[PDB]
Amino acid sequence: NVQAHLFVSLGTAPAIVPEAFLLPGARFVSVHVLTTERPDVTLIREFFRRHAPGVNLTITRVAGFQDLKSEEDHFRFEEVMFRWFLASRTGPEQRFVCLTGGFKTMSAAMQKAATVLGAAEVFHVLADDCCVGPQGRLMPPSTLEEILWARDQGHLHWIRLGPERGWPQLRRIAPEQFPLQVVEEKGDERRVQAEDRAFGTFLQDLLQRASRIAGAWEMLPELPFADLATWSEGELAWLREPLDPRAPADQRWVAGLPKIELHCHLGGFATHGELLRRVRNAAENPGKLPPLEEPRLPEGWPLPAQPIPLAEYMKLGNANGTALLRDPGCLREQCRLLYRHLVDQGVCYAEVRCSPANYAEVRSPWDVLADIRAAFQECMEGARTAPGGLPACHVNLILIATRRASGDYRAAIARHLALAVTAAEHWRDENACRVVGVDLAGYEDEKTRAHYFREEFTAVHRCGLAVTVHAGENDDAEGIWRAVFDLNARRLGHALSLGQSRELLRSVADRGIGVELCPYANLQIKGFRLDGSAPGPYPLLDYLREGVRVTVNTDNIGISAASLTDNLLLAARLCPGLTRLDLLHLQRHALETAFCTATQRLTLLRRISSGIPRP
Amino acid sequence: NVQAHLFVSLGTAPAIVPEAFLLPGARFVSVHVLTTERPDVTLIREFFRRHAPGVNLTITRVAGFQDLKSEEDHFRFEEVMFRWFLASRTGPEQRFVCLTGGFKTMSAAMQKAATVLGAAEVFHVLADDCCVGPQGRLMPPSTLEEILWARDQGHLHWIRLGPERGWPQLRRIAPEQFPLQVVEEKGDERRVQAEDRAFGTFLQDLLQRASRIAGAWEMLPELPFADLATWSEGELAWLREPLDPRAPADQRWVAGLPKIELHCHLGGFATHGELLRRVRNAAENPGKLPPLEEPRLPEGWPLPAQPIPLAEYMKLGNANGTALLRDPGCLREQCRLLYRHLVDQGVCYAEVRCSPANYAEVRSPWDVLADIRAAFQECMEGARTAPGGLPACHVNLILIATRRASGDYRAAIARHLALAVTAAEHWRDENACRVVGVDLAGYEDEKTRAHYFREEFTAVHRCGLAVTVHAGENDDAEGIWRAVFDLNARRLGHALSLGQSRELLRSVADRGIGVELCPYANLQIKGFRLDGSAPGPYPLLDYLREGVRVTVNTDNIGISAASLTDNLLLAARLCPGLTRLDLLHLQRHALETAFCTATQRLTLLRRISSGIPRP
RNA sequence: AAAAAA
Ligand SMILES: Nc1ncnc2c1ncn2[C@@H]1O[C@H](COP(=O)(O)OP(=O)(O)OP(=O)(O)O)[C@@H](O)[C@H]1O
Ligand SMILES: Nc1ncnc2c1ncn2[C@@H]1O[C@H](COP(=O)(O)OP(=O)(O)OP(=O)(O)O)[C@@H](O)[C@H]1O
Ligand SMILES: [Mg+2]
Ligand SMILES: [Zn+2]
Ligand SMILES: [Zn+2]
């Protein structure tokens, strides 16, 4: 029932096409022959005209491939041959290829094309010297009665080297993508040419990807992303030695790495430098704007010699936040600048934390939250880059419930929780900015631990909203235990005091509770030894080794005055021996621990896997 | 600096090896030539005698290949050629392949071997017509001085096709496992033979596996296991279609599939049939053993016509349990039978639940727990099958905290919690039976829900022990919520009422809390519509589509009188349209939600991926 | 059985 096409080459010796045609036990249609525009193809024409009028064969000649002097003529022949294979709409069960005729290059390339595209059968035809001619014992010449005599007396062999399968993504391809130009067109004969050197690269890197996947098919689950498997021994080993923050090549590598952000405060981005001026000169009511005050930073701020406690750390960001973001224009420009910075950093997903109730003096906190989400959504729709028509960076909101040492803050906590619940129930579109969780931040001690806040978080847990808590910054492992088991937090922020309790670490690893580490905030607040030269060692390596889902974030960009790439670089700095594979593991942990739907999680996994650059 | 070995084929036309040896720039050593038996090789011998002493060329001729009449001699030549390539301790970096010489098939096989094994360079020679010969316009057959004359004025081309990479698995290999046989030996010439056509199959199915991986690479994240991506389009399409429990092929495949057990009761295995008698005839004191009475099973017990209550379900297993297992010999025999059943069922991991406090009359419950674990450990050590010296089935212990409608049961639950904590702190070896979690089992109601037990459970949360709870079988989603959030349960048992509340389902899916469903026990107790022909539909399909982590188990094997395979078949029956990919998803969910270390998780995942049978 | 099926 199959059409059973014939694909054959032709050289200076004609009559190979006709003998290849009458293969036993197979009726053929549309035999296609390839030549090199030196030899004549008349004999096959008269044979098929007199002995098989329903074959409608074609002859293809190759673009001034006169004779084999160099390499490039062979390469153009191979490319035109591959495009000629593609040009006929033929299934794998229809192609019958004979690697006979002409140069051995043509035969070997035909065998390679058959084994790559999965031809239905490959065969070689032989004839016996049964002709008198001018001198006896001659191969059968052009004339047709002698070739029929050679057939019916049994002087042909037809060795066939079995069927082939071929690549699955290269079985059909598309005969509209790779084109064949016809320099001269005439009745049942064409001379073709390929404008570009395209299919060679496609075949080469497809076979390369197959070889690399086969080479690293083992230990694939240990990889964080599937697409790392197509990286060869050299680049796999390149991703195994410890990171070198000094090298500009490593810095360029980290900068181009797609990144996932989870610990980000909207109120600590534009506090110093020109960004603060850009946010100040956008207010709707500049008359009542507070006077421009720049808080002084300690000497050597990004790498301070002496740690500073939390109160001065909060006071560093007094230039921005509640004092400045009351005006709608300032908040809108702050949101736009934050999105621009996130996209410039290469972040494919971020979760910005905001406290709209602190920005309500005449407009409601609901109005502030609506304005923030509207600014984020409009800036999302503005930047419609990336494949699939998806936003370049996807940002979700987390409401902040902040706690103070003294004063009135519980009413604020209740208001934030109710607003977060209502906002989560309001916006449910998957491809849009949403409120995905709540936070428990602020001053922490024995008397403001997580277990004092169960009763109002009962409503949030009933609603089914994600919860994250600040714990371990200024508290021992008891605070982390209260946050994990009495408040049921899904992610912990700055869990530096987790290593004291082995059982707590085992529990946090086993239930898959995420842990967020900000190297700049931890270094500036608690202080850590740099480059291996008593706060204790930075716990990133221990957390990774013990299996707990750890991630690196930025905390306050403006207060710390650096971005996520700088945080990753100094995370490598704090722990000697940290590897780029560990950075990819942190990326996978952040992707898996983030607050997003399963489909969006798969989309981000695919995007990050296919967006990893190469050394 | 490399050695630059050469591999060149020879036909009936000599003086191509001398032309292949001459290369513009490359210093060659140990030229190797492959030939049939009849054609002359003397000319290359004299050429390397008087022009290259330190070259030590070798000639190898195929034993039974002189003129090809069929494909068998081509195949034996193919195999012996691959064995000859492997027989030289050489790498790709110094391998130079020349395809000049012989049939078109030999050149094609030469290029295929070069591109598979990988070579530093593949090429071949072309000769312009230089010598006059006996008739008009010949080209050099012989006359090595004339060959040098053609060389120094340049009528030879040496078309340099290019370099190959080759598959990493077959770069080096070793000729010892794929050797050659020398039929005769004299000088540097040898006639060789290969016993079996084994390397051809190895290369063929290696390339086949590469094709399977390339075809399913895009959908790898959706696949439960990486090894499932090497199954071809036919087996993938077979797997995607819905399961048919009627077909014996499907039943055989489900039986052969490796399984993970998470819900098995040690007190409900040997209750009826010959297993009961086998347990009974092992007691240390048969005289004090109670009489033999079996409760009558309802009509059509495995598929009862009507739903049944829980009290008579408990009474149905009165032949085994506290009435029989208080004897140490009976308990040890029961553990041995349970392990043998688990191994026969194909289980590679199970967690058996026990209540040692119910088996203490003269011996402490600690003695019962120690005896049970010792029996399981000796069963493990006896059956040290499987690769890596790892036991065929790994069994962990989960203590049961029983709830009663009325009476004295809180002392028992306190005993069980303390015993579980002490047993967890006793045994800590990774590759051995351990007490890994606790249960909250027994009758429950509005006044016997989970949240009343928090004061009892905080200790087992402080010591770092996993907790699982029964809920949802005779109550609404409120018990599920209190178990998830007030007790921090990591797995829920029989959560059939979870579908009513969307918020709790989303919370359970987000937090990744495992859900264990037993189709036989649920069908018997609650009753459900079979084959789509009011308790509502069975929630397996809805749970899988919603993303919640669900598993299928056996509950009480003896009481239900069925195994894991029957449970999976009935799970398919209860949800028409259930596909085999959903079964693999269930196995992956059970693997991930099991209470075990990360290394054990990786080993279990890799062995389950490599242990899935094909259709 | 290299520039053109043994
Ligand atoms: N790294 C941190 N550790 C602890 N608390 C933090 C940290 N970063 C920010 N916070 C707290 O987060 C709360 C909310 O901050 P937000 O980002 O909304 O800025 P803000 O409105 O300018 O802050 P503030 O209330 O200090 O004026 C603030 O009370 C701040 O104390
Ligand atoms: N399907 C079920 N649902 C709820 N509880 C169950 C179920 N099956 C068993 N249990 C409870 O599990 C606890 C332990 O059962 P196990 O079979 O290990 O012991 P046993 O000696 O058979 O129990 P018992 O003395 O209650 O008959 C018992 O309290 C039983 O009530
Ligand atoms: Mg502030
Ligand atoms: Zn924070
Ligand atoms: Zn049970």
Side-chain angles (χ1 to χ4, degrees), chain B residues 146-350:
Chain B
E146 192 271 331
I147 295 170
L148 295 175
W149 182 258
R151 176 268 292 268
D152 60 356
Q153 58 89 210
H155 287 193
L156 279 293
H157 295 311
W158 292 277
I159 49 187
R160 200 169 267 91
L161 271 184
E164 299 325 300
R165 283 222 91 180
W167 305 87
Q169 289 82 17
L170 57 87
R171 291 299 225 297
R172 322 313 197 103
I173 318 297
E176 291 83 4
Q177 55 87 29
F178 275 164
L180 282 302
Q181 291 83 17
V182 176
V183 308
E184 60 92 9
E185 173 41 72
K186 183 57 37 172
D188 57 27
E189 154 162 13
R190 35 168 62 100
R191 303 190 29 250
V192 296
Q193 183 40 33
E195 192 273 332
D196 49 358
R197 216 192 310 292
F199 185 83
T201 72
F202 177 71
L203 183 62
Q204 161 203 320
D205 63 357
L206 182 62
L207 292 204
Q208 175 165 106
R209 193 170 90 59
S211 66
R212 314 284 191 65
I213 298 170
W217 180 246
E218 76 299 350
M219 69 168 88
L220 183 62
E222 278 69 351
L223 269 43
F225 307 112
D227 190 300
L228 213 52
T230 63
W231 269 27
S232 88
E233 82 292 19
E235 281 154 287
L236 268 296
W238 172 95
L239 170 143
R240 284 212 150 64
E241 81 205 340
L243 184 44
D244 174 281
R246 311 317 204 291
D250 291 331
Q251 307 193 3
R252 293 190 297 271
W253 180 76
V254 172
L257 158 65
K259 293 150 191 92
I260 297 280
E261 180 44 272
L262 292 173
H263 205 59
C264 183
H265 287 247
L266 190 143
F269 181 35
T271 63
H272 296 105
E274 58 97 18
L275 292 190
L276 184 62
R277 274 72 174 176
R278 274 182 59 58
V279 175
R280 294 259 292 196
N281 67 359
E284 320 278 21
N285 190 359
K288 68 180 179 67
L289 206 161
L292 204 165
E293 66 288 8
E294 270 157 309
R296 186 197 99 71
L297 281 64
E299 68 275 16
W301 178 225
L303 292 191
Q306 272 314 81
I308 62 174
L310 189 149
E312 57 90 29
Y313 187 97
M314 293 301 298
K315 296 199 43 55
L316 189 150
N318 263 339
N320 200 308
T322 62
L324 176 63
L325 293 175
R326 298 167 289 121
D327 189 85
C330 293
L331 183 62
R332 207 171 330 104
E333 186 66 24
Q334 163 97 359
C335 277
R336 275 193 202 73
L337 271 69
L338 176 45
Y339 190 99
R340 283 290 310 99
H341 175 285
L342 275 192
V343 174
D344 185 75
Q345 205 55 208
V347 166
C348 67
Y349 184 95

Side-chain angles (χ1 to χ4, degrees), chain A residues 68-71 74-75 99-105 107-109 111-112 115 124 126 157-162 165-169 171 204 207-222 226-227 229-230 232 454 458 461-465 467 478 481-482 484-486 488-490 503 507 510-511 596 602 605-606, chain B residues 68-71 74-75 99-105 107-108 111-112 124-126 157-169 207-215 217-222 226-227 229-230 232-233 454 458 461-464 467 478 481-482 484-486 488-490 503 507 510-511 596-597 601-602 605-606:
Chain A
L68 184 59
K69 332 297 194 62
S70 66
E71 289 325 278
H74 172 273
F75 289 102
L99 52 89
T100 295
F103 292 159
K104 277 164 307 157
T105 82
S107 192
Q111 157 84 336
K112 180 172 72 69
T115 189
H124 190 151
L126 300 175
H157 274 56
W158 283 298
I159 69 177
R160 54 182 102 201
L161 295 174
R165 179 68 180 270
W167 294 125
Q169 68 288 32
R171 251 174 268 270
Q204 190 65 343
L207 273 295
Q208 204 70 281
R209 293 179 65 251
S211 66
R212 311 256 192 82
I213 298 170
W217 178 251
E218 303 82 10
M219 52 72 78
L220 175 53
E222 293 298 17
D227 200 3
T230 63
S232 75
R454 293 201 62 267
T458 59
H461 286 323
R462 292 247 172 238
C463 180
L465 208 59
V467 177
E478 184 62 25
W481 192 94
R482 312 311 297 231
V484 174
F485 282 89
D486 290 330
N488 295 0
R490 297 190 31 191
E503 66 287 10
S507 189
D510 282 332
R511 330 170 64 102
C596 75
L602 269 296
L605 188 150
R606 259 178 201 80
Chain B
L68 65 86
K69 279 74 175 176
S70 65
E71 299 89 299
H74 176 285
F75 274 142
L99 61 88
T100 289
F103 292 156
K104 289 299 182 62
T105 58
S107 174
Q111 161 147 40
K112 168 163 176 43
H124 63 280
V125 302
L126 293 174
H157 295 311
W158 292 277
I159 49 187
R160 200 169 267 91
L161 271 184
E164 299 325 300
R165 283 222 91 180
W167 305 87
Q169 289 82 17
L207 292 204
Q208 175 165 106
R209 193 170 90 59
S211 66
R212 314 284 191 65
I213 298 170
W217 180 246
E218 76 299 350
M219 69 168 88
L220 183 62
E222 278 69 351
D227 190 300
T230 63
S232 88
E233 82 292 19
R454 312 191 62 272
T458 180
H461 280 317
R462 206 60 73 103
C463 284
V467 58
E478 175 57 39
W481 185 98
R482 294 265 180 212
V484 170
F485 284 128
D486 276 350
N488 291 318
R490 301 187 32 192
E503 60 275 35
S507 179
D510 291 333
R511 316 184 82 87
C596 64
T597 61
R601 204 92 68 67
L602 268 298
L605 189 150
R606 72 180 53 267

Side-chain angles (χ1 to χ4, degrees), chain A residues 263 265 353 439 470 494 555:
Chain A
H263 201 70
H265 296 254
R353 321 184 163 188
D439 195 322
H470 274 245
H494 310 138
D555 195 329

Side-chain angles (χ1 to χ4, degrees), chain A residues 254-273:
Chain A
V254 160
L257 179 67
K259 292 183 282 297
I260 276 174
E261 177 44 32
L262 280 74
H263 201 70
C264 199
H265 296 254
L266 182 63
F269 168 53
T271 62
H272 292 354

Side-chain angles (χ1 to χ4, degrees), chain A residues 483-542:
Chain A
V484 174
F485 282 89
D486 290 330
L487 187 61
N488 295 0
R490 297 190 31 191
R491 304 210 320 260
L492 309 188
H494 310 138
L496 304 179
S497 182
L498 208 170
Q500 304 79 326
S501 315
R502 283 302 95 171
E503 66 287 10
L504 183 60
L505 182 62
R506 276 278 62 89
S507 189
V508 167
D510 282 332
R511 330 170 64 102
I513 296 170
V515 175
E516 305 147 353
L517 298 176
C518 296
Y520 285 152
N522 298 342
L523 182 62
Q524 294 177 355
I525 280 179
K526 307 255 284 183
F528 298 85
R529 303 159 22 82
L530 275 296
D531 293 329
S533 178
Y538 186 72
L540 184 62
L541 292 176
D542 188 76

Side-chain angles (χ1 to χ4, degrees), chain A residues 265 267 314 320-322 355 359 400 402 404 470 473 555-556:
Chain A
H265 296 254
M314 314 293 209
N320 197 347
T322 301
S355 287
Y359 312 144
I400 297 293
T402 185
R404 323 290 199 180
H470 274 245
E473 181 180 1
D555 195 329
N556 293 313

